Short mmCIF file of all heavy atoms in Angstrom, two decimals:
data_model
loop_
_atom_site.label_atom_id
_atom_site.label_comp_id
_atom_site.label_asym_id
_atom_site.label_seq_id
_atom_site.Cartn_x
_atom_site.Cartn_y
_atom_site.Cartn_z
N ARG B 263 12.01 -1.57 -0.84
CA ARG B 263 13.17 -0.95 -1.48
C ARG B 263 12.78 -0.01 -2.61
O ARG B 263 13.58 0.87 -2.96
CB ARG B 263 14.12 -2.03 -2.00
N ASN B 264 11.60 -0.17 -3.21
CA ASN B 264 11.14 0.72 -4.26
C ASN B 264 10.10 1.73 -3.77
O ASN B 264 9.48 2.41 -4.59
CB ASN B 264 10.59 -0.08 -5.44
CG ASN B 264 10.55 0.73 -6.72
OD1 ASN B 264 11.46 1.51 -7.01
ND2 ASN B 264 9.50 0.55 -7.51
N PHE B 265 9.90 1.84 -2.46
CA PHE B 265 8.96 2.78 -1.86
C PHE B 265 7.53 2.52 -2.31
O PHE B 265 6.72 3.44 -2.43
CB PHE B 265 9.38 4.22 -2.16
CG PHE B 265 10.77 4.53 -1.71
CD1 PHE B 265 11.83 4.38 -2.57
CD2 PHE B 265 11.01 4.93 -0.41
CE1 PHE B 265 13.13 4.64 -2.15
CE2 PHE B 265 12.30 5.20 0.02
CZ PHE B 265 13.35 5.05 -0.85
N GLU B 266 7.21 1.24 -2.54
CA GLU B 266 5.86 0.80 -2.83
C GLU B 266 5.25 0.16 -1.59
O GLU B 266 5.92 -0.08 -0.59
CB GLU B 266 5.86 -0.18 -4.01
CG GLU B 266 6.18 0.48 -5.35
CD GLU B 266 6.14 -0.49 -6.51
OE1 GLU B 266 5.04 -1.03 -6.82
OE2 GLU B 266 7.20 -0.71 -7.13
N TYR B 267 3.92 -0.06 -1.65
CA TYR B 267 3.23 -0.79 -0.60
C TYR B 267 3.35 -2.29 -0.84
O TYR B 267 3.29 -2.73 -1.99
CB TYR B 267 1.74 -0.42 -0.57
CG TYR B 267 1.49 1.04 -0.30
CD1 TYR B 267 1.43 1.96 -1.34
CD2 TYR B 267 1.29 1.50 0.99
CE1 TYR B 267 1.20 3.30 -1.09
CE2 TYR B 267 1.07 2.85 1.25
CZ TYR B 267 1.03 3.73 0.21
OH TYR B 267 0.79 5.07 0.47
N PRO B 268 3.48 -3.10 0.21
CA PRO B 268 3.37 -4.55 0.01
C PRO B 268 1.97 -4.86 -0.48
O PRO B 268 1.02 -4.15 -0.18
CB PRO B 268 3.63 -5.13 1.41
CG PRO B 268 4.19 -4.01 2.21
CD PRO B 268 3.59 -2.76 1.63
N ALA B 269 1.87 -5.89 -1.31
CA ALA B 269 0.55 -6.37 -1.72
C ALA B 269 -0.09 -7.22 -0.63
O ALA B 269 -1.33 -7.32 -0.58
CB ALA B 269 0.64 -7.14 -3.03
N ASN B 270 0.73 -7.87 0.19
CA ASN B 270 0.30 -8.67 1.34
C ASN B 270 -0.05 -7.73 2.49
O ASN B 270 0.83 -7.13 3.10
CB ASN B 270 1.41 -9.65 1.71
CG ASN B 270 1.03 -10.59 2.86
OD1 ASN B 270 0.11 -10.33 3.62
ND2 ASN B 270 1.78 -11.68 2.98
N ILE B 271 -1.34 -7.65 2.82
CA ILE B 271 -1.80 -6.69 3.82
C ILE B 271 -1.34 -7.02 5.23
O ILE B 271 -1.52 -6.21 6.14
CB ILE B 271 -3.34 -6.56 3.81
CG1 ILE B 271 -3.99 -7.83 4.35
CG2 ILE B 271 -3.83 -6.25 2.41
CD1 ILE B 271 -5.49 -7.73 4.44
N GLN B 272 -0.81 -8.22 5.46
CA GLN B 272 -0.22 -8.51 6.76
C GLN B 272 1.21 -7.99 6.86
O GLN B 272 1.85 -8.14 7.90
CB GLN B 272 -0.29 -10.01 7.07
CG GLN B 272 -1.72 -10.48 7.38
CD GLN B 272 -1.80 -11.94 7.82
OE1 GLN B 272 -0.84 -12.50 8.34
NE2 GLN B 272 -2.96 -12.55 7.60
N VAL B 273 1.73 -7.40 5.79
CA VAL B 273 3.05 -6.80 5.80
C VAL B 273 2.85 -5.29 5.88
O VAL B 273 2.29 -4.68 4.96
CB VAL B 273 3.86 -7.18 4.55
CG1 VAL B 273 5.29 -6.64 4.65
CG2 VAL B 273 3.86 -8.67 4.36
N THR B 274 3.25 -4.70 7.00
CA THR B 274 3.10 -3.27 7.16
C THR B 274 4.10 -2.52 6.27
O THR B 274 5.25 -2.95 6.12
CB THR B 274 3.26 -2.88 8.63
OG1 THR B 274 4.49 -3.41 9.13
CG2 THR B 274 2.09 -3.43 9.45
N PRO B 275 3.70 -1.41 5.67
CA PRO B 275 4.60 -0.71 4.75
C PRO B 275 5.80 -0.15 5.49
O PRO B 275 5.77 0.12 6.69
CB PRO B 275 3.72 0.42 4.19
CG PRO B 275 2.30 0.02 4.50
CD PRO B 275 2.38 -0.76 5.77
N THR B 276 6.88 0.03 4.73
CA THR B 276 8.09 0.61 5.29
C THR B 276 7.77 2.01 5.85
O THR B 276 6.84 2.67 5.39
CB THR B 276 9.18 0.67 4.23
OG1 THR B 276 10.43 1.04 4.82
CG2 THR B 276 8.84 1.67 3.13
N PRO B 277 8.47 2.43 6.91
CA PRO B 277 8.11 3.71 7.57
C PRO B 277 8.06 4.92 6.64
O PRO B 277 7.18 5.78 6.80
CB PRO B 277 9.20 3.87 8.63
CG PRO B 277 9.57 2.48 8.98
CD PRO B 277 9.47 1.68 7.70
N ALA B 278 8.98 5.01 5.68
CA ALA B 278 8.99 6.15 4.77
C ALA B 278 7.69 6.24 3.98
O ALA B 278 7.24 7.35 3.64
CB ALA B 278 10.17 6.03 3.81
N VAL B 279 7.07 5.10 3.70
CA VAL B 279 5.79 5.04 3.01
C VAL B 279 4.63 5.16 3.99
O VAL B 279 3.68 5.89 3.74
CB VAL B 279 5.74 3.74 2.19
CG1 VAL B 279 4.34 3.47 1.67
CG2 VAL B 279 6.73 3.81 1.03
N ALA B 280 4.72 4.47 5.13
CA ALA B 280 3.63 4.51 6.10
C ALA B 280 3.39 5.92 6.63
O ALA B 280 2.26 6.26 7.00
CB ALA B 280 3.92 3.55 7.26
N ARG B 281 4.44 6.76 6.61
CA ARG B 281 4.36 8.14 7.09
C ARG B 281 3.34 8.99 6.34
O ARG B 281 2.87 9.99 6.88
CB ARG B 281 5.74 8.80 7.00
N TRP B 282 2.99 8.63 5.10
CA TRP B 282 2.05 9.45 4.34
C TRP B 282 0.62 9.30 4.84
O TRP B 282 -0.23 10.13 4.48
CB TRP B 282 2.13 9.10 2.86
CG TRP B 282 3.49 9.19 2.33
CD1 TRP B 282 4.48 10.05 2.74
CD2 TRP B 282 4.07 8.36 1.33
NE1 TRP B 282 5.63 9.82 2.02
CE2 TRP B 282 5.40 8.79 1.15
CE3 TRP B 282 3.58 7.31 0.55
CZ2 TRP B 282 6.25 8.19 0.22
CZ3 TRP B 282 4.43 6.72 -0.37
CH2 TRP B 282 5.75 7.17 -0.53
N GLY B 283 0.34 8.28 5.63
CA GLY B 283 -0.96 8.11 6.23
C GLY B 283 -1.74 6.97 5.59
O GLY B 283 -1.40 6.47 4.52
N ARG B 284 -2.78 6.55 6.30
CA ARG B 284 -3.69 5.53 5.79
C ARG B 284 -4.69 6.16 4.83
O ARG B 284 -4.94 7.36 4.85
CB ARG B 284 -4.41 4.82 6.93
N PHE B 285 -5.26 5.33 3.96
CA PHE B 285 -6.20 5.85 2.98
C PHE B 285 -7.05 4.70 2.46
O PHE B 285 -6.63 3.54 2.51
CB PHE B 285 -5.48 6.55 1.83
CG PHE B 285 -4.63 5.64 0.98
CD1 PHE B 285 -5.12 5.14 -0.21
CD2 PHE B 285 -3.34 5.29 1.36
CE1 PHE B 285 -4.34 4.30 -1.01
CE2 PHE B 285 -2.56 4.45 0.57
CZ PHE B 285 -3.06 3.97 -0.61
N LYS B 286 -8.25 5.03 1.99
CA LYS B 286 -9.09 4.07 1.30
C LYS B 286 -8.64 3.92 -0.14
O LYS B 286 -8.53 4.91 -0.87
CB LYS B 286 -10.56 4.50 1.32
CG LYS B 286 -11.46 3.57 0.48
CD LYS B 286 -12.93 4.00 0.44
CE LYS B 286 -13.82 2.82 0.09
NZ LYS B 286 -15.13 3.25 -0.47
N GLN B 287 -8.38 2.69 -0.57
CA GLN B 287 -8.03 2.42 -1.95
C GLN B 287 -9.23 1.83 -2.68
O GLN B 287 -10.09 1.20 -2.08
CB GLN B 287 -6.83 1.47 -2.04
CG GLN B 287 -7.14 0.01 -1.68
CD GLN B 287 -5.88 -0.83 -1.62
OE1 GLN B 287 -5.80 -1.90 -2.21
NE2 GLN B 287 -4.88 -0.33 -0.90
N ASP B 288 -9.27 2.05 -4.00
CA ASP B 288 -10.31 1.46 -4.83
C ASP B 288 -10.15 -0.06 -4.83
O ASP B 288 -9.04 -0.57 -4.97
CB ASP B 288 -10.17 2.03 -6.25
CG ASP B 288 -11.42 1.90 -7.09
OD1 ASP B 288 -12.22 0.98 -6.83
OD2 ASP B 288 -11.58 2.71 -8.03
N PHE B 289 -11.26 -0.79 -4.68
CA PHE B 289 -11.21 -2.25 -4.72
C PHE B 289 -11.63 -2.82 -6.08
O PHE B 289 -11.80 -4.03 -6.20
CB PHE B 289 -12.05 -2.88 -3.61
CG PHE B 289 -11.36 -2.94 -2.26
CD1 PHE B 289 -12.02 -3.41 -1.15
CD2 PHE B 289 -10.04 -2.55 -2.12
CE1 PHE B 289 -11.40 -3.47 0.09
CE2 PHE B 289 -9.40 -2.59 -0.88
CZ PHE B 289 -10.08 -3.06 0.22
N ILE B 290 -11.78 -1.97 -7.10
CA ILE B 290 -11.92 -2.45 -8.46
C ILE B 290 -10.77 -3.38 -8.80
O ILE B 290 -9.61 -3.14 -8.41
CB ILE B 290 -11.97 -1.25 -9.43
CG1 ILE B 290 -12.40 -1.70 -10.83
CG2 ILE B 290 -10.59 -0.49 -9.43
CD1 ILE B 290 -12.63 -0.55 -11.78
N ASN B 291 -11.07 -4.47 -9.51
CA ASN B 291 -10.00 -5.38 -9.90
C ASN B 291 -9.08 -4.66 -10.88
O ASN B 291 -9.54 -4.04 -11.85
CB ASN B 291 -10.56 -6.66 -10.53
CG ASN B 291 -9.46 -7.67 -10.78
OD1 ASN B 291 -8.74 -7.57 -11.77
ND2 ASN B 291 -9.33 -8.64 -9.88
N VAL B 292 -7.77 -4.73 -10.63
CA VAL B 292 -6.85 -3.90 -11.39
C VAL B 292 -6.72 -4.37 -12.83
O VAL B 292 -6.16 -3.65 -13.65
CB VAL B 292 -5.48 -3.84 -10.69
CG1 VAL B 292 -5.64 -3.24 -9.29
CG2 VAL B 292 -4.84 -5.22 -10.63
N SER B 293 -7.26 -5.55 -13.18
CA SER B 293 -7.29 -5.97 -14.58
C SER B 293 -8.14 -5.04 -15.43
O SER B 293 -7.95 -4.99 -16.65
CB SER B 293 -7.78 -7.42 -14.72
OG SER B 293 -9.15 -7.52 -14.37
#
């Protein structure tokens, strides 16, 4: 509902978000 990605990787993003394409994200701990 906020056009964010789920944090749970088994939850596929909503189509409006998934449409932007896949990408490599930084795996640095966000802390």
Side-chain angles (χ1 to χ4, degrees), residues 264-280 282-283 285-293:
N264 200 39
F265 304 92
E266 290 181 65
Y267 300 88
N270 183 341
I271 70 176
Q272 288 185 26
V273 186
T274 52
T276 189
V279 169
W282 306 329
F285 66 98
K286 174 182 202 202
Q287 73 187 230
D288 200 333
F289 278 176
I290 192 173
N291 187 280
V292 300
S293 68

